[model samples]
Target: AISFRPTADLVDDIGPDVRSCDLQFRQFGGRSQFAGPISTVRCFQDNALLKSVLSQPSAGGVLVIDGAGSLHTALVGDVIAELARSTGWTGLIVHGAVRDAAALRGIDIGIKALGTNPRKSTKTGAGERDVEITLGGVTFVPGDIAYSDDDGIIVV
Candidate 1:
């Protein structure tokens, strides 16, 4: 499915409503273009909530995880990303790291993160979901529209 509009085009078409991200994130996964309503999570060093949330059935939305810029461990990986796709998630944006880069490249989902990590996260289920989260100078709120491409991410 053609699920995205280019960020540059969106900027030209809907300038005022869009808020572009200033951070440079590494892109992974099969999809590089993705757009959808936002779903947010605020957590650090743990992805228990993320795993639980993605495992459920969501129609289609973008998961914006605020991991407090932690590079210590990966917050998302092949397994969780597969679950995200299975549950109909369009994309994911992590203000942290992700693992399984090779495996992630095969999944037909959009993903962007600060970098990659070899270590997995703690499974403590410690975090909040569907809330406002600020990362890379942008405040992502649930229910807002998000668009991403090779250019960058933008919220509306």
Candidate 2:
């Protein structure tokens, strides 16, 4: 995948639809705001280790966190988004909610989640990583390319 300012640019240029994609953002749905490679993770609101991974210099990759559609807390925040942006992550595609939406907009990164929540997640460094996790009728694997835009998400 290449770096882009908006996901809409990719959707408008690419077609064929052979690849399938979905949008977890039903409420915050809009154009994608991040740019970079795709990295996948499977965790259910346990983002302790998730952040650790995104903080690595070798981790400048999109983090697709599978939170199992849980809205109890936000999986990503301004802190994590800032870490990702500075650390080199293109965007974050979360299967859950996120807080600090307003603050997140200030950062130069893309974010797509189910919605937003005021509460944050627990500190238990539990949940799986680098494994295939399915949600919203989509299966995500580590290193799998994830493309998105205002139209929707597409996996390749």
Candidate 3:
């Protein structure tokens, strides 16, 4: 995988800077060097499909779940995160909430989420997979490269 940094001076070295890259997060810890191809998902209040998709081995790619910015439910948790890590997922970027903060901190997977919630999502499996959705005023195409650091998020 390619190397990158959290320093503002190095931002330009990466591709297009994420316009929506904001520090509005709790900085859940993960593998410091996680990087991969991109996978995209879209869900609403319930994240049943999110869990299903994330469970599969992620071909050295990251899963970008667009949860519609819902704080009502968590899109990911400790158990799912563990599965993701073991399956070779480089990282997970959720435009929503997540649970199991401490559990995530112990793992080597890169995780960046808006925040956390004790509420797990409804298991209706009602969502779409591999669809392009808008977030942070940017379009995240499936397979598009995504890079993240404690400083912010960016896509290219």
Whose TM-score is greatest here? Answer: 1
Over 4 Å off, model 2: 1-17, 24-35, 58-60
lDDT of 2 by residue, 1-156 (tens): 365433455555666543445543642322354444556677777789789888886444667888887888999888888887788777788888898888877777778888889898886888776877665556766766666665666555
C-alpha lDDT (0 to 100) for residue 3 of candidate 1: 51
Clashing residue pairs found in predicted model 3: 31-108
Candidate structures ordered by lDDT, highest first: 1, 3, 2
Cα error, residue 29 of model 3, in Å, equals: 2.7
For candidate 2, the TM-score is 0.81
The C-alpha RMSD in Å for every predicted model, in order, reads 1.7, 3.1, 2.5
Q: What lDDT does each candidate get?
A: 0.89, 0.71, 0.75
Residue 140, candidate 1: C-alpha displacement in angstroms: 1.0
Candidate 3, superposed: residue stretches over 4 Å from native? 1-10, 14-23
Q: Between 1 and 2, whose TM-score is larger?
A: 1
The window of 10 residues in a row where model 3 has the poorest summed lDDT is 14-23
| lDDT, candidate 1, 1-156, per-residue tens | 235788998789877656888889899989998998898888999999998888887767899999988999999999999999999998999999999999999999999999999898999999998889876567888988888999988787
Error of 1 at 86 (Å): 0.5
Question: Which window of ten consecutive residues has the lowest lDDT sum in model 2?
Answer: 27-36
